[PDB]
């Protein structure tokens, strides 16, 4: 994973996301979801998403939601006050903790002010706490800024690692992007019957054609205006459209 | 300024547990910046080191002495205590409690120096 | 490991200079940048006056001075007063396990 006060930035794009394959796999501690209760994601489609990894203490996942404070909400990490996503986060002492310490695990301590929301700083400028200038040597109120959670795996639970991903969806105002998958089933034919091709809705009979259209169009019209063929998404095969029957 | 001020004394016999109290004023526990730590001295001898606990519960503790010192932190009446089980005669020493200032390591634990402010330091016995 | 301060006593006379060193094992404490002495009176809490290496802190006498060579750190003073008979101790960050050494102690005495 990647440490808490240099956290990564993967910004996901145009596919097919599947959130539950997330939210049931039982193997999460904490599933928050914030703008948008779980259920609903494979659902909705945004313009991008952005996924924030890094690894903390167990107990200082409470930090990571909008409006919170404390040394990593403070100056590591700081969310939004009217975030979107959804917050993931699960245990992993046996990966990360490793007998004698890790030390290769570290977070910043002391900052002149807090983070902007998704605001992200990498310096190593010793800290100036008193008036007396630093001019770069450590001492009395001049301190190194970053800390190292030294982890072992004999740690009692909210001392051990975990990792966290912060999903975050957000929707600048571009034309579509991102969206879950849609299901399906099989085509039947000869059976007045409720259809949808991939958008065209509607309710008729289903026959085998023998048109042919050009290998981009989708649908056949009629004069008036009206659908009266399609062409079938996987097999790629045209079949007319009629009406059931009324009198 | 800072000050520090040691309790929980008393004629402690043998093979018992005892108990220091080192309590802080003008500086806050979970800070950050500063180890809070412990130091004996036998009567007429020299010093020596015994632990450090840092505000988020980080721990050292001298190897001679090991597994048989706990240091913790109460951050609710900013004070901290040590806690020495099996006690024999041999530690009949003046205690100190001070804080460090225990610059940054490099992936492999924070080394300290120097520290700052010695507690007043309470003469503890044991004897029958 | 302990850095034996030396020498244990210390005669001096009021007014010149006095230099105590402390040796100790390898550049696990000599060859570092950390060391420390402390001043304890007898029947008080000791008191730091040099950290680092060579650092006063916020306020002290300017006789007060150290310096390194080696395996060796030297504690030097430059001029004697009554008021200076204690005790001094060395410090030092180790890496083998006892973390933090302490010295054995000089006795410093104003004979006169």
């Known amino acids: 994973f990647a440490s808490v006060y240099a956290w990564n930035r993967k910004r996901i794009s145009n596919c097919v996301a599947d959130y539950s394959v997330l939210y049931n796999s039982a193997s999460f501690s904490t599933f928050k979801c914030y703008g948008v209760s779980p259920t609903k994601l494979n659902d909705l489609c945004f313009t991008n998403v952005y996924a924030d990894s890094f690894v903390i203490r167990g107990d200082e996942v409470r930090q990571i939601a909008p409006g919170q404070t404390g040394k990593i909400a403070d100056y590591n990490y700081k969310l939004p006050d009217d975030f979107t996503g959804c917050v993931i986060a699960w245990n992993s002492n046996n990966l990360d903790s490793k007998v004698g310490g890790n030390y290769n695990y570290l977070y910043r301590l002391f900052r002149k002010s807090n983070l902007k929301p998704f605001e992200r700083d990498i310096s190593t400028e010793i800290y100036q706490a008193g008036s007396t200038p630093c001019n770069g040597v450590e001492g009395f109120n001049c301190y190194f800024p970053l800390q190292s959670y030294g982890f072992q795996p004999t740690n009692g639970v909210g001392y051990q690692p975990y990792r966290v991903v912060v999903l975050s969806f957000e929707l600048l105002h571009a034309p579509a992007t991102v969206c879950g998958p849609k299901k399906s089933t099989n085509l039947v034919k000869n059976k007045c019957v409720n259809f949808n091709f991939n958008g065209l809705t509607g309710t008729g009979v289903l026959t085998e054609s023998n048109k042919k259209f050009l290998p981009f169009q989708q649908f056949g019209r009629d004069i008036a205006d009206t659908t009266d063929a399609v062409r079938d998404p996987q097999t790629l095969e045209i079949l007319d459209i009629t009406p059931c029957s009324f009198g | 300024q800072v000050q520090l001020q040691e309790s929980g004394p008393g004629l402690v016999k043998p093979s018992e547990t005892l108990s220091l109290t080192c309590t802080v004023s003008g500086d806050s526990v979970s800070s950050g910046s500063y180890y809070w730590s412990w130091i004996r001295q036998p009567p007429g001898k020299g010093l020596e080191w015994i632990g450090y606990?840092?505000?988020?519960?980080?721990?050292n503790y001298n190897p001679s002495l090991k597994s048989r010192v706990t240091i913790s932190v109460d951050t609710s009446k900013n004070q901290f205590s040590l806690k020495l089980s099996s006690v024999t005669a041999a530690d009949t020493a003046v205690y100190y409690c001070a804080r460090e200032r225990c610059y940054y390591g490099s992936g492999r634990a924070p080394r300290c120096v120097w520290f700052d402010p010695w507690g007043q330091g309470t003469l503890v016995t044991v004897s029958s | 490991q302990s850095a034996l301060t030396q020498p244990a006593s210390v005669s001096g006379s009021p007014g010149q200079s006095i230099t105590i060193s402390c040796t100790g094992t390898?550049?696990?404490?000599?060859?570092?940048?950390?060391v420390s002495w402390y001043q304890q009176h007898p029947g008080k809490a000791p008191k730091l006056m040099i950290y680092?290496?060579?650092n006063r802190p916020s306020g002290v006498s300017n006789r007060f001075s150290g310096s390194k060579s080696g395996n060796t750190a030297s504690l030097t003073i430059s001029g004697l007063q009554a008021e200076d008979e204690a005790d001094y101790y060395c410090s030092s960050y180790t890496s083998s396990s006892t973390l933090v050494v302490f010295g054995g102690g000089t006795k410093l005495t104003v004979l006169g």
């Open positions: 606990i840092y505000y988020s519960g980080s721990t």
């Open positions: 390898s550049s696990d404490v000599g060859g570092y940048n950390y």
């Open positions: 680092d290496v060579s």
